[PDB]
Paper text:
The deposition of H3K36me3 occurs co-transcriptionally when the methyltransferase SETD2 associates with RNA polymerase II. The deposition of H3K36me3 is carried out by the conserved histone methyltransferase SETD251. Here we present three cryo-EM structures of SETD2 bound to RNA polymerase II elongation complexes at different states of nucleosome passage. Together with functional probing, our results suggest a 3-step mechanism of transcription-coupled H3K36me3 deposition.
To investigate this, we prepared another complex for cryo-EM analysis on a 15 bp longer ligated nucleosome template, representing transcription to bp 174 into a Widom 601 sequence. Sample preparation, data collection and processing were performed similarly as for the State 2 complex, leading to a reconstruction with a resolution of 2.6 Å for Pol II and 3.6 Å reconstruction of SETD2 bound to the nucleosome. In the resulting State 3 structure, SETD2 is bound to the distal H3 tail at SHL + 1. The additional 15 bp of DNA induced approximately 20 bp of DNA to rewrap the nucleosome, making the proximal H3 tail inaccessible for SETD2 binding. SETD2 binding to the distal H3 tail, at SHL + 1, facilitated unwrapping of distal DNA to approximately SHL + 4.5. Analysis of the overall architecture of the distal H3K36me3 complex demonstrates the nucleosome rewrapping has rotated the nucleosome by ~ 45°, positioning SETD2 on the opposite side of SPT6, such that the interaction between SETD2 and SPT6 could be maintained. Compared to State 2, the overall architecture of State 3 demonstrates that continued transcription would allow rewrapping of the nucleosome that repositions the distal H3 tail of the nucleosome to allow the catalytic SET domain to bind, whilst maintaining an interaction with SPT6. Further transcription enables rewrapping of DNA around the proximal histones and repositioning of SETD2 to the distal H3 tail, facilitating methylation of the distal H3 tail and completing H3K36me3 deposition on the transcribed nucleosome (State 3).
Numbering used by the authors:
A (entry chain f), G (entry chain b): 24 to 101
B (entry chain h): 35 to 123
C (entry chain e): 39 to 133
D (entry chain k): 934 to 951
E (entry chain g): 15 to 117
F (entry chain a): 68 to 133
H (entry chain c): 14 to 117
I (entry chain d): 32 to 123
The structure:
DNA sequence: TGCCTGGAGACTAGGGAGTAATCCCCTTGGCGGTTAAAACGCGGGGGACAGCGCGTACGTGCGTTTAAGCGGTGCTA
DNA sequence: AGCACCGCTTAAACGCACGTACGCGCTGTCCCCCGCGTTTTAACCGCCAAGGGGATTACTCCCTAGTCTCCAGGCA
């Protein structure tokens, strides 16, 4: 149970960067599930690329390709 | 030249006493062409990342597992594996 | 001396829209990531830049979702965000 | 015992293999 | 005999092999690849036509129409995910009314 | 058809059109407008109303990415 | 002004297909502008493909290619 | 022995772009003006984004250009925001924006 | 192993428009990713345009059409102008 | 049905990929120390939600008007 | 095949009348989230060490492109 390691002040700081002034008490269980669906899609694609590349190690280019497949296009990691 | 007679051959095996209109035949033609272009483009992308010069049943299988959903991709991999097993034996 | 509720909230909005650092800690996120990954292939090993890219993409996704959540909450003539605003944003977004 | 208007089907003919 | 008779399929193999060399994908297509892709296309075609035939029998008809294709695709969990950004001509929408509007 | 020809005079004078080329435009335009109203009705229900406002259309086009 | 040819009961009929029960009085003037912007974008890309292909008639495959460029795949006119 | 970049008057290379066109499975043949045209377009886009990045670096009283300056330079221009509307920049942050109803 | 880059070329572009301004490695990597992404977009659109008209050669007309479809507004006008100016000087 | 154009059957050469060896870089595991950050109460002011009243804007219905379809013909880009 | 014209019909658009359901404004209450203070915990830095797998090179088999001949599958 490591999705409880995404604490309440961290979600509150992400909401303060998002512009939110006042926060209810039920946002956190929704945000953890949304984060654990987005992770469970990107790591699924990254482990598929790794399992095709005949590799023991998930690199960063697999993650960049997994994000490019979904339309995210992250810059800064090659 | 199209896939119309092959769509008729597939349709007469799952539902014998039925027909199909020409508009639905054109929609099935567009569907077959779109899925062909998607799988061929993803298999062309997979062969460049590993610096290989080809495309192979492993490449097509990896392009199927990335593109199709969970219950559909398993049956697609099983049908393709059975068809490529029957080709050599 | 105490601040009236909202002044510290706007102060945090101003300082975290000014800063550029990461907000989620690294070891809980890494333990979350290493636990999710093993359900796709056996014996997974990680570089540092893969998790460093996952954390950037995850926080960018969450900030981009809370912006539309705030827009839905303002459209509903409120200030407090609610889970139904998140559900409306993810329904209109196409997810 | 009851049927719909055939015009519904007339607007989209069946594919002709020839 | 043809290779579609060897593999036991119904879609052709030589046309798929010709479209793989011809469409500039790699300096080389492999082999088992057109047979594998023809099996995948035949399975997907048979699934679409099976659900379209069920949707056509549900309305007392004997000819599959684009409305029957629309209902067959949109009334399935995974085909709607595969074809979410596709607009079918003469297809229409799904009948649904929100529960806060009915008296 | 007159609207499409009028807005197509702004890009190239003395053009010519087919019939399926205007039919495809009409299909795409009707599907786009139906999807826009399907999201806008959800916006208006979330705003606790029945009548549909232009602010709901602007909210739908803002959240969608347009 | 052929934008007034898209009449009020046509927009009302599109809203009845979209599931809308009650309509205000500015939705028509909003919808005309939205449709105008969308059609200007698609006609601009279609005329670009037509001028590239050295033709003078605008075929339907140019419209299908422009709709694919926007990201809206259309089955039937191929 | 002059190069083709000196003959075209550009700063980006031409032979590397020609090698990447010939070794990338795009077509069978490659014309002799296409890498010159593409290097001109890439050099123009590079100078266009670096002008705004240098303006942001002068505005924030700095000497070097940082990803925050690149983020401000892209998101403060409308055409670059439309061209790069699906791009996430690492260590770039967001824009300062507070709605007018949240503050008294 | 020796690997391709664009860092010296981005530095040569930067030392013309701003004679006194540095650049960091993170910003140089973002610029390399930007150049690679725009290259892939224009080359893919040109290779898609080359197949519709049943041609085999990608030329500057296909590259110009791929630029005109992909860049919005006056940026496409200036890109076409710069490219035509660079192709005109190459032949002479 | 005509037939013809694309698909099958052998044979060969050359380079592409599969196997084995070995380096050494980088990933994983562990122990301690500091302190910043997370966790837990607590009082209170502010906002979400419910109830009520009112005026108007948008619905349904009927009579008149208008131009969208529906054919037929011809010329030419 | 696309554009231009022509005659006819009739179904859809427009305009006006009227009534009532709903959007908006006001008020009251009470729950609940926020600022603040104190205590507990594990994140982060620093250092160390074992060893597993990425990466490169060399050799060799075998797989597919190319060419020639033959002949039937499918499209009007």
């Amino acid at each position: 149970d490591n999705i409880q390691g995404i604490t309440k002040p961290a979600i509150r700081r992400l909401a303060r960067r998002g512009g939110v002034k006042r926060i209810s008490g039920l946002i956190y269980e929704e945000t953890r599930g949304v984060l654990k669906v987005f992770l469970e899609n990107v790591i699924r694609d990254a482990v598929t690329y790794t399992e095709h590349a005949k590799r023991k190690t998930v690199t960063a280019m697999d993650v960049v390709y997994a994000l490019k497949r979904q339309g995210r296009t992250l810059y800064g990691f090659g | 030249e199209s896939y119309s007679v092959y769509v008729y051959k597939v349709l007469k095996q799952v539902h014998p006493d039925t027909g199909i209109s020409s508009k639905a035949m054109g929609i099935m033609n567009s569907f077959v062409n779109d899925i062909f272009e998607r799988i061929a483009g993803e298999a062309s992308r997979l062969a460049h990342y590993n610096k290989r010069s080809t495309i192979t049943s492993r490449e097509i299988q990896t392009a199927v597992r990335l593109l199709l959903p969970g219950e559909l991709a398993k049956h697609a991999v099983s049908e393709g594996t059975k068809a490529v097993t029957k080709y050599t034996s | 001396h105490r601040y009236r509720p909202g002044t510290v909230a706007l102060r945090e909005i101003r300082r975290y829209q000014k800063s550029t650092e990461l907000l989620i800690r690294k070891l809980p996120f890494q333990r979350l990531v290493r636990e999710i990954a093993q359900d796709f292939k056996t014996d997974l090993r990680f570089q540092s830049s893969a998790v460093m890219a996952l954390q950037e993409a995850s926080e960018a996704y969450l900030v981009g979702l809370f912006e539309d959540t705030n827009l839905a909450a303002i459209h509903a003539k409120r200030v407090t965000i609610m889970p139904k605003d998140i559900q409306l944003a993810r329904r209109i977004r196409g997810e | 015992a009851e049927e719909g208007d055939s015009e519904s089907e007339i607007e989209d003919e069946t594919f002709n293999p020839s | 005999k043809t290779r579609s008779s060897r593999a036991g399929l119904q879609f052709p193999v030589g046309r798929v092999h010709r479209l793989l060399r011809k469409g500039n994908y790699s300096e080389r297509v492999g082999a088992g690849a057109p047979v594998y892709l023809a099996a995948v296309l035949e399975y997907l075609t048979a699934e679409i036509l099976e659900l379209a035939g069920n949707a056509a029998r549900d309305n007392k008809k004997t000819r599959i129409i684009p409305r029957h294709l629309q209902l067959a695709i949109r009334n399935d969990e995974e085909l709607n995910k595969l074809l979410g950004r596709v607009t079918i001509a003469q297809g229409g929408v799904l009948p649904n009314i929100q529960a806060v509007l009915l008296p």
